[PDB]
Structures are given as C-alpha cells and as structure tokens.
Design an enzyme around this catalytic site. Structure first.
Site, PDB file in Angstrom:
ATOM      1  N   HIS B  87       0.836  -1.176   0.000  1.00 37.15           N
ATOM      2  CA  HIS B  87       0.000   0.000   0.000  1.00 37.15           C
ATOM      3  C   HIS B  87       0.888   1.250   0.000  1.00 37.15           C
ATOM      4  CE1 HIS B  87      -3.595  -2.266   0.967  1.00 37.15           C
ATOM      5  NE2 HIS B  87      -2.897  -2.947   1.914  1.00 37.15           N
ATOM      6  N   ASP B  90      -1.208   8.754  -1.729  1.00 41.74           N
ATOM      7  CA  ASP B  90      -1.174   9.905  -2.625  1.00 41.74           C
ATOM      8  C   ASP B  90      -2.068  10.972  -2.018  1.00 41.74           C
ATOM      9  OD1 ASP B  90      -1.909  11.807  -4.822  1.00 41.74           O
ATOM     10  OD2 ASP B  90      -2.237  10.173  -6.247  1.00 41.74           O
ATOM     11  N   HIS B  92      -3.681  14.490  -2.716  1.00 39.26           N
ATOM     12  CA  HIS B  92      -3.937  15.489  -3.758  1.00 39.26           C
ATOM     13  C   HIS B  92      -3.547  16.891  -3.355  1.00 39.26           C
ATOM     14  CE1 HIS B  92      -7.210  13.145  -6.223  1.00 39.26           C
ATOM     15  NE2 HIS B  92      -6.081  12.425  -6.139  1.00 39.26           N
ATOM     16  N   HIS B 127      -5.510   9.050  -1.175  1.00 35.19           N
ATOM     17  CA  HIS B 127      -5.893   7.693  -1.453  1.00 35.19           C
ATOM     18  C   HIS B 127      -4.662   6.827  -1.723  1.00 35.19           C
ATOM     19  CE1 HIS B 127      -5.289   7.954  -5.881  1.00 35.19           C
ATOM     20  NE2 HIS B 127      -5.798   9.200  -5.773  1.00 35.19           N
ATOM     21  N   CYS B 128      -4.847   5.528  -1.595  1.00 34.11           N
ATOM     22  CA  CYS B 128      -3.805   4.592  -1.970  1.00 34.11           C
ATOM     23  C   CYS B 128      -3.705   4.481  -3.487  1.00 34.11           C
ATOM     24  CB  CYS B 128      -4.124   3.257  -1.347  1.00 34.11           C
ATOM     25  SG  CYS B 128      -2.913   1.970  -1.566  1.00 34.11           S
ATOM     26  N   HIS B 138      -7.636  -0.567  -5.044  1.00 33.39           N
ATOM     27  CA  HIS B 138      -7.448  -0.175  -3.660  1.00 33.39           C
ATOM     28  C   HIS B 138      -8.385   0.969  -3.297  1.00 33.39           C
ATOM     29  CE1 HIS B 138      -3.612  -2.337  -2.380  1.00 33.39           C
ATOM     30  NE2 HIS B 138      -3.966  -2.917  -3.523  1.00 33.39           N
ATOM     31  N   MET B 143      -9.826   2.652   0.255  1.00 33.52           N
ATOM     32  CA  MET B 143      -8.584   3.295   0.665  1.00 33.52           C
ATOM     33  C   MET B 143      -8.496   4.716   0.180  1.00 33.52           C
ATOM     34  SD  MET B 143      -5.586   0.396   0.887  1.00 33.52           S
ATOM     35  CE  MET B 143      -4.777   1.455   2.098  1.00 33.52           C
ATOM     36  N   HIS B 248     -26.902  17.056  -1.888  1.00 35.22           N
ATOM     37  CA  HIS B 248     -28.095  17.871  -1.692  1.00 35.22           C
ATOM     38  C   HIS B 248     -28.546  17.651  -0.244  1.00 35.22           C
ATOM     39  CE1 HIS B 248     -31.948  19.791  -2.696  1.00 35.22           C
ATOM     40  NE2 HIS B 248     -32.448  18.967  -1.875  1.00 35.22           N
ATOM     41  N   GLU B 272     -28.894  24.592  -4.507  1.00 34.10           N
ATOM     42  CA  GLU B 272     -29.769  23.469  -4.174  1.00 34.10           C
ATOM     43  C   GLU B 272     -28.966  22.179  -4.099  1.00 34.10           C
ATOM     44  OE1 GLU B 272     -32.974  22.413  -7.149  1.00 34.10           O
ATOM     45  OE2 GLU B 272     -31.780  23.676  -8.542  1.00 34.10           O
ATOM     46  N   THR B 273     -28.148  21.955  -5.114  1.00 35.22           N
ATOM     47  CA  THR B 273     -27.401  20.724  -5.302  1.00 35.22           C
ATOM     48  C   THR B 273     -26.063  21.125  -5.885  1.00 35.22           C
ATOM     49  OG1 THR B 273     -29.439  19.511  -5.698  1.00 35.22           O
ATOM     50  CG2 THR B 273     -27.406  18.516  -6.594  1.00 35.22           C
ATOM     51  N   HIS B 299     -27.957  13.360  -5.220  1.00 36.36           N
ATOM     52  CA  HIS B 299     -29.249  13.543  -5.869  1.00 36.36           C
ATOM     53  C   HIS B 299     -29.369  12.794  -7.193  1.00 36.36           C
ATOM     54  CE1 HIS B 299     -33.280  15.175  -6.371  1.00 36.36           C
ATOM     55  NE2 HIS B 299     -33.213  15.828  -5.196  1.00 36.36           N
TER      56      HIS B 299
HETATM   57  O1  LIG Z   1      -3.870  11.014  -7.715  1.00 35.07           O
HETATM   58  N1  LIG Z   1      -4.337  10.252  -8.548  1.00 35.07           N
HETATM   59  O2  LIG Z   1      -4.906   9.156  -8.741  1.00 35.07           O
HETATM   60  O1  LIG Z   2     -34.983  16.824  -2.214  1.00 37.30           O
HETATM   61  N1  LIG Z   2     -34.523  15.701  -2.355  1.00 37.30           N
HETATM   62  O2  LIG Z   2     -34.668  14.587  -2.904  1.00 37.30           O
HETATM   63 CU   LIG Z   3      -3.732   0.111  -0.742  1.00 37.61          CU
HETATM   64 CU   LIG Z   4     -34.758  16.579  -4.193  1.00 40.00          CU
HETATM   65 CU   LIG Z   5      -5.767  10.689  -7.145  1.00 39.93          CU
END
Ligand SMILES: O=N[O-]
Ligand SMILES: O=N[O-]
Ligand SMILES: [Cu+2]
Ligand SMILES: [Cu+2]
Ligand SMILES: [Cu+2]
Ligand SMILES: OC[C@H]1O[C@@](CO)(O[C@H]2O[C@H](CO)[C@@H](O)[C@H](O)[C@H]2O)[C@@H](O)[C@@H]1O
Ligand SMILES: OC[C@H]1O[C@@](CO)(O[C@H]2O[C@H](CO)[C@@H](O)[C@H](O)[C@H]2O)[C@@H](O)[C@@H]1O
Ligand SMILES: OC[C@H]1O[C@@](CO)(O[C@H]2O[C@H](CO)[C@@H](O)[C@H](O)[C@H]2O)[C@@H](O)[C@@H]1O
Ligand SMILES: O=N[O-]
Ligand SMILES: O=N[O-]
Ligand SMILES: O=N[O-]
Ligand SMILES: O=N[O-]
Ligand SMILES: O=N[O-]
Ligand SMILES: O=N[O-]
Ligand SMILES: O=N[O-]
Ligand SMILES: O=N[O-]
Ligand SMILES: O=N[O-]
Ligand SMILES: O=N[O-]
Ligand SMILES: O=N[O-]
Ligand SMILES: O=N[O-]
Ligand SMILES: O=N[O-]
Ligand SMILES: [Cu+2]
Ligand SMILES: [Cu+2]
Ligand SMILES: [Cu+2]
Lengths: 334, 334, 334
Positions: B87, B90, B92, B127-128, B138, B143, B248, B272-273, B299
């Site tokens: 493992h 990474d 970001h 993440h891995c 992974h 992960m 949402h 809203e979303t 949503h």
């Molecule tokens: O960071 N990238 O998969």
């Molecule tokens: O408002 N939501 O499904």
């Molecule tokens: Cu891993």
């Molecule tokens: Cu909705």
């Molecule tokens: Cu990534």
C-alpha cells in the site's frame, strides 16, 4: 396571521411559462398555485412505446412556477381519488420539512395546502418524494418540475448590467427506465404498481432506456419546435431531477449561464456546453444572431440522437454572412 | 534541517473531525499524523452483504486530517504484517512524487514517513495508489480519505466577510463493486486477493452495486445521525475519490459552497445541489433555520434511496412558520 | 467582399499544437486551415484490439486549431473518394447553421470551404455531425477535435495579471465502443459500415469499452510522454466531445483552470481535479515545481488504469525537499 395580497397564477404546460414580470415594483405577495396529480399511461417514442407516468398537472415536466424573492408560494396539491398511490411535494427552493415533503403526503382523494417563503433566488427543482424506494420511482416516473424565484430587480450580469429576456422556455429532461422482455421489446404495464418491480430492477442498473425533453422523443420538434427571431434574448431553463445533463445549443452559445441555477451568483459567459447536476435546475440565455434551425441537446450525443434528448429551435431573420459563410459549396476535389 | 515546532494530532473516525482552529495565530508547524492500514471484511448493508475493505485507520472514509496553509504534514504510514498487500498514499494536496505515492510504497511489516508542505488551500482527497490496475482496486475497496488545508485567517465569503463554522462533518462517499453469483446473490470472499478477479470484471463495467456514506448503508442514520441546532453553521466536507456525486441537503441549501473544494476561490451561494467530481473533495456550509429531520443525499435518487447514499440530520430548535407552514392539513377534496 | 490578410496554418498532430502567438499585435486575419477526413482501421490497445476510426487529418483527436478573437477561420474540409461515408463539421466556436454542419455536408470525392468569425474566446470542440443517429456514431468513431480562440492580449487571471504559457498540449479523450463476441473477445470489422449495427447497440448502453487519450491506450507514455521542466508553465487543453471527464495531474494541480473552457470567465485557482462536460473543451495551466514522472488521468481511476485514460509527463529539474521529502524510507515496523 400573514396579511399580504393574494395573487392567483394560471399555470401553463411546458415548455411555455405563465406570464410574469422580471423586474417588479410589487412587494411580497402570497402567490397561489394549484397542482393536480395525474397518474397515466403515455406514449414516449415514435415507435409507440408506453410508459406508466406520474405527473404534476398532467405534464412531464410539471409546469414552471415563477415568483419573486420574498414572495410566499401557497400551493394546493391535489391527489384525486382516480389515482392509486400517495404523493407529496418537495420544493428545493423551500426551507424545512424536507422541502415540504413531510407536510404534504396525501392519499388518493386528499389535498393539502403548503406555503413556503421564497428566500433563495434561482431556478429550482420540485419533485414528489413519498419515502424510501418510492422517492426515485416517483421522480423517474415523471413527478418533477421546477420553480423560478426572480430577484425583484430582475436578472443581472454580475457587472451591474440588467439582463432582460424576451422569452423564456422550460426544458424538463426525464430519464426513463422501461424494461424489455426476453426478445428485446419494451414492456407495457396495466398500472404503475404492476410496472414497479421490473422498473426498479432496471433503475438500480443506472442506465435509462430513454432520455427525453417534455415527456416524449420529438416533443419539442416540428409543430412544437421552440421559436425565436434574430435579435431576441431567450432564457432556457433546464431541469433534471435525478441525473446529470450537459445542455448545448447547436449553432449557438450560452451567452450568460447559471449552470448551478442560482441568481445570487454571477452568470458565466460565452459557454459552449453547460452542466445540470442531477437534482437541479440551471438556466442559460442566448441572443440569437442567425436564422434557421438549431438543435438543443444534451451533449452526450448518444442520448441526444438515439435515446430522445433533442429539441429544435426555428429562428426567423436575416442571415449574417460576416459571422458565417459558405465560401465554396460542395464540389469535386480538384 | 526543518526547524519548526512539532504538533501531534489524534485522528478521529469520520464523520467527526479532530479538534482544530479555523483562524490561527500560530505560524507554520510540522503537524504529525499516523495512519495504520487495515484490510478487513466488513458488512456494508442491512441485508448482511460483506465486502473486502482496505482502509486507512480502520474506517471508510479514512479520517479527515486538518492543517493550515504553510504547515508541513508529516505522516507515518504503517502497513502491519497482518495485511496481505502493499500500500501507499497519494495526497492530492501535495506537490511531487505522484502526491507522495512514489515515496510511500510499503509491504506488510513496513512503515514510511512522508512530509509535504501544505501550499494549496481547500479540501483534498488522499488515497492509496500502488500502481497499475491496483490503483482503482485499492481506492474502490475503501482506501481513500481527505485532508483540509485552511487559510490561517479561516474561511471567507470572497466579499471580505469571515465564514466561521460551528461544527464540521466529513461525509466520505464510496462506490462499491460487489459481484453477484448466477442466481443473483452478492458474493462473499475469503480475502481481498480472492475478491480481485470478480471485482475487477465488475469495476470495468462502471456500475456500482452500492454507493454509501461512511462505509455502510445507513451509517449516518439513527443513533449515528448527524446533528445540529437551529442557528448553527455546519460545514459538510464531501469526498469521492473515484466517481462523481451530486450532494443535496433535503429541506436546506448550500449557503456557501466550494464544489471544486478550493478556498482560493470564492464560494458560490444559495445552491440546491452541488457537484463533487470524482477524484476530489468539496465543501458546503449551511446555517440551519428549521428543526426536524433532514436527509443529505447524492441527488441521483436511485443511488440515494436504493444503493445506500443517504445520511440524516436531526436538528433541534423552534419551527419558523414564516419560512414554511402547512396552511391546511391533508383533507378530503371538496 | 472580406478584405483582410490571409494566413495559412500548417496543422500538426496532437498532442502538439501548431505555432502561434499568445498576445498579438496583428489585427484580424482570415486564417486558412485544411482538414482531410480519413476513415481507417486502427489499433487502440496493447492487446491489438482494432477499431473502425473516422478522423479529421488522420488523428484522434483531430488537430488543435489556434486563432485569435475576431479572426475569420476559413476551413477547407476534404472528403476523399477513398472514404465510404458523407461527413461534415460543426464548430462549437461558430455561430449559425448548426456550427457549420448544415453548410459542410460532403460526399466522398467532395470538398467544401466554410468561414466563421471567431467571436467567442476559449477552447471549443469541433466534430462531425452528419444527421440523426450518424451524429453520435461519427463522433465516438473519432471525428472530433478542438479549436482555441485566444484573446488578442493573451490570457489573464481575472485579477489583471497576464498568464503566459511556455508550452501547450492538447489531450483529446475518446470514449470508444468496441463490441465483444459470445466468448468475450473484442470484434473486428471490415468497414465502418459493417461495424455500425453492433457498435450502435453497444453505444446505446452508455458504457465504453475503452477511454483513451490521443487515440490509443498508452499513446502519451514512453517515447511519447509529455515533457516539461521545473519552472515551466504548461497549458493542457482537454476535450471530450460526447462524455464527461474529470482531469487530474497526479503530483500536481491546476494552478489556473477554465473547466468550462471559456476565457471571458476568470480561471479557478488551485484545483485538484476539474470537470470537462461532454461536448466541451476546457483548459488548465500548471507551473511545474518538482521533477519526475507525473500521470495525467481522468479521475475515474477505473477508466484511467483499466480502460486506457492515462498520460505521463516526464519532468526535468531539481527536487525541492521543502515541498516534499521522504523523512524515513520504508523500514520494518518497530
Ligand atoms: O492522484 N491520482 O490518482
Ligand atoms: O430533495 N430531495 O430529494
Ligand atoms: Cu492500498
Ligand atoms: Cu430533491
Ligand atoms: Cu488521485
Ligand atoms: O449577478 C449576481 C452577482 O452580482 C453582484 C455584483 O458583482 O451583485 C449584483 O447582484 C446582486 C444580486 O442580484 C445584487 O444584490 C447586487 O446589488 C448586484 O451588484 C455579486 O455580488 C453577485 O454575486
Ligand atoms: O474567498 C476567496 C476569494 O476572495 C478574494 C476576495 O474577493 O480574496 C479573499 O480571500 C483570499 C484568500 O483567502 C485572501 O488572500 C484575500 O485577502 C481575500 O480578499 C478573492 O481574491 C478570492 O478568490
Ligand atoms: O479573466 C477574465 C475575467 O477578468 C476580468 C477582470 O476581472 O476581465 C479581464 O479579462 C477580460 C477578458 O480578457 C478583459 O476584457 C478585461 O479588460 C480584463 O479586466 C473579468 O471581467 C473577466 O470575467
Ligand atoms: O418476458 N418477460 O420479461
Ligand atoms: O454541436 N452539437 O452536437
Ligand atoms: O436539422 N437540424 O437539426
Ligand atoms: O424575419 N425575416 O425573415
Ligand atoms: O460537383 N462538382 O464540382
Ligand atoms: O457462481 N458463480 O458466479
Ligand atoms: O424521514 N426523513 O428523511
Ligand atoms: O431546542 N429546542 O427545541
Ligand atoms: O379528511 N377529511 O377531510
Ligand atoms: O459472435 N457474435 O457476436
Ligand atoms: O509511474 N508513474 O505513474
Ligand atoms: O534539469 N536538470 O536535472
Ligand atoms: O527494513 N528494515 O528496517
Ligand atoms: Cu408521487
Ligand atoms: Cu463524419
Ligand atoms: Cu456538438
């Protein structure tokens, strides 16, 4: 209690929008709407495929409701005894009680009256949401529409300039899940209830059989094409209650676009294609520059051309050779 | 070498977040974290479906790490001998060496210490990513987590006003791929290795069997509902390391939203979303106005209601009839 | 008629970009381009899978065309008699006649000359769109590219500062739909026409078999990795004509990103992952800080690692231990 003037609205079926003011000198009102739920079997494509639809006011999408910031929206939701299922309404524009859903569950034979204060500007989805697995099923059966909450001063570009539209259209996009039988034909059902088990199985696989505007393949073409003239500024409200979309006006642009759909944010300018997150409405305005036919699509072109998601505009006016010209028509290669 | 004060953090399991300052008068520190990888078979739904999970610190998502811009983040990553696979990690948020992945590959029985300077503000996935086809496997096995890099002056609205949250929750969304046998039951496996061939085959078809928050259907409901009070400003960090999501808050809004998740950009208002691009974290803050239960969903309502992606908030306080009221309770249609 | 200077461009194959100015003192010109359509069977993966491609200028993506705002773009589109199908071109940068598609339909043996005024700045898709179901089929067969319309003053950050890139690359992402036979091997076909029925059936199911950059798995790796040096500002234009993507530079960031791709909007800053809506191009610039290998992916990691959507950068320069360092190399746990 609440001592404001009352104003009734006569809703109109999409893609048209009931008459309203953009900027207004009216102060807050209680704006009264009525939505009557209709469950009905409809035809969704040119092959005659049928579909167990569930609708607000008989249409997919439900009609666009238009109010101004600070208005109170008082909706009488009616579930006639001729329907089979309970239903409710969730307004994404509203605050509290699951958008209203927790206050509006009505059995066939009942109605309910909900009021909410329009404290958030923009275009917003409304949809049915009875509970549990019924929520997606009612939504993808057609039970969704939108509501537009305008600033009282109308729209602006974020740089101090008013943006006034000459007309507005509402394009409601619907992902539909119609199962197929063993030999590969779409199934028909006698009731929504009878359609549920096969429909849910398909739904959970997350691939629609149809993606349509205004409830049917081809709904917004031919006699029912959208229209404009060169020089007109058209607002196109687009909603999708369950699944992402990527609108595009073929031969045009989004001059001013609120892809997240909320007028407290400035619009983006000069877009080719924009993005409607599932569970939302967005809006784009464009001033037409050229006559002729335009297509308005989701720009997954498979969805657009093959699953139903194409509308047309027919635009009148004078061609502008400065903007585009065919220098040499098709000819044999030298 | 690097002569700054050292500060240890005791990580806490999601959806909670370890104690931290928003605005701070501290200057840069070396902030020390430990992540211990655990591969384990877990239950992911209320039917008792099992899943070969791979985790940082035993949870899905991995815990939220919180630092400030210009801090140095020094992580001891531990891969105990009781695990079966190599493992790595990474970030970001980090610059160079594949986010750290090229410097942190550890076999069972090994640990490694990576330091990175937090030069970019926002919420970010970690993440891995061991290499090749192992990378997605992974990640979708669990992960992944997130790290929040706050400005030293705390958050702002882009218009000069501070935005201070009263509490923060971390919702990690996980797309899971559990194969089914011929009759249609989910399969169980004796090890991650044994799950790999069937799981990869399914993965490549890009349709998850489950989409969950905090590692399980229903994880953030009942006893474990999120909570707030009317008047509280809540920050909700949402991550998805592999696949898009559209958060949402049902009955609420995103008052201030960084959907791309990066605090050098002003938030959008009144959504809203919103949209979490796969491979990212975003954040939304909302000031609760109404008591009662809220659902927090993706949503795509099929995913939300049918595949697992629903959390609840239980909110205490006084109902505001100005914002919403049931004018007439359900009654027979006249 | 139109009395401006004419300038010919020699197009170059992606991911490279023909020589151009960023800021310019030239006024409007008629910039002349030629695109020759080629239908051809190609290899798309390291296993030797074949694919019936349809291309502009022999490449997937078609080459990047670069002009400035207010230029006129005069394209000679050539459909040699050695092709089997009609073809046309739709420029998302253009105004009228379906982006040009309604003015450029040419049978094998024909050519056509279209001019459009570059009134909208940004990066834009161009693609073939013959009509009806042919539209998605030609696009997902490879018939798409992009055009960049720069401001005459070059790019800016929205806060008054110029953003000048040291180099630009064009990454065109292609969703491909290769059917499989009963035992599960990819099918080969003798012509695009022969591939159509099986390919359309698959297309409508909305799951690609391959997602590639520059037309093939691994195209932008090894000898053909992208390159940079520490200190260089690189612009990465990304297009996807049919389907969403979520670009991410592993070990880097998007310092300035126009995810909707349109330079009338300020860039976002400091992104981890951005979003290219299907039917669009976007752009991200990054100043490299660290040497070594980077991967550039769509951050659906299944797509990236398993379906083809990974490019590499090889970056020269001096490692910066302040930004990242391996404090302790892998060692036995104490
Ligand atoms: O960071 N990238 O998969
Ligand atoms: O408002 N939501 O499904
Ligand atoms: Cu891993
Ligand atoms: Cu909705
Ligand atoms: Cu990534
Ligand atoms: O378009 C919304 C965007 O514009 C700004 C000005 O940059 O504010 C304008 O719009 C507000 C909402 O309608 C008005 O209240 C305000 O007076 C007007 O300047 C931004 O603040 C806003 O995000
Ligand atoms: O919210 C970020 C957004 O706000 C602006 C002001 O419009 O800058 C503010 O935030 C910066 C980052 O925290 C501070 O450095 C700056 O002093 C503050 O004005 C924008 O520049 C930024 O995009
Ligand atoms: O980056 C575009 C963004 O910047 C602003 C200034 O905030 O305008 C700049 O860019 C325009 C387009 O290139 C120039 O015309 C303008 O002079 C320059 O200030 C915004 O208006 C724009 O959205
Ligand atoms: O024939 N039944 O699916
Ligand atoms: O330009 N539209 O497919
Ligand atoms: O024929 N127009 O889309
Ligand atoms: O509107 N005239 O063609
Ligand atoms: O079509 N003849 O040039
Ligand atoms: O029964 N095996 O999938
Ligand atoms: O019952 N509330 O989602
Ligand atoms: O917090 N009071 O209900
Ligand atoms: O429920 N009766 O009106
Ligand atoms: O073997 N034909 O798919
Ligand atoms: O090995 N680098 O992606
Ligand atoms: O460019 N020097 O390694
Ligand atoms: O690898 N030994 O510590
Ligand atoms: Cu309903
Ligand atoms: Cu073609
Ligand atoms: Cu197009």
């Amino acid at each position: 209690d609440l001592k404001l003037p009352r104003q009734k609205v006569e809703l109109v079926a999409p893609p048209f929008v009931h008459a309203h003011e953009q900027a207004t000198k009216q102060g807050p009102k209680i704006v009264e709407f009525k939505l009557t739920i209709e469950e009905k079997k409809v035809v969704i494509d040119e092959k005659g495929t049928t579909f167990q639809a569930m609708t607000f006011n008989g249409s997919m999408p439900g009609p666009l409701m238009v109010v101004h910031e600070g208005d109170y929206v008082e909706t009488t939701l009616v579930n006639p005894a001729t329907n089979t299922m309970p239903h409710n309404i969730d307004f994404h524009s509203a605050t509290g009680a699951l958008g209203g859903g927790a206050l509006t569950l009505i059995n066939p034979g009942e109605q309910v009256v909900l009021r909410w204060k329009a404290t958030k500007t923009g275009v917003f989805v409304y949809h049915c949401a009875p509970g549990g697995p019924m929520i997606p099923w009612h939504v993808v059966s057609g039970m969704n529409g939108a509501v537009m909450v305008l600033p009282r001063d109308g729209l602006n570009d974020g740089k101090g300039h008013a943006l006034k539209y000459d007309k507005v259209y509402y394009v409601g996009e619907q992902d539909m899940y119609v199962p197929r039988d063993e030999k590969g034909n779409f199934k028909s059902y006698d009731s929504p209830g009878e359609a549920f088990t096969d429909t849910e199985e398909m739904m959970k696989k997350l691939i629609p059989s149809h993606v349509v505007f205004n409830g049917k393949v081809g709904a917004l073409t031919g006699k029912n094409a959208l229209t404009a003239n060169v020089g007109e500024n058209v607002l196109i409200v687009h909603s999708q209650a369950n699944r992402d979309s990527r609108p595009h006006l073929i031969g045009g642009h989004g001059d001013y676009v609120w892809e997240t759909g909320k007028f407290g944010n400035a619009p983006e300018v000069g877009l080719e294609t924009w993005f409607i997150r599932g569970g939302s409405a967005g809006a784009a305005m464009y001033k037409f520059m050229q006559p002729g036919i335009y297509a308005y699509v989701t720009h997954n072109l498979i969805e657009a051309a093959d699953l139903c998601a194409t509308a047309h505009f027919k635009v009148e006016g004078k061609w502008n050779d400065d903007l585009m010209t065919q220098v040499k028509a098709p000819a044999e290669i030298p």
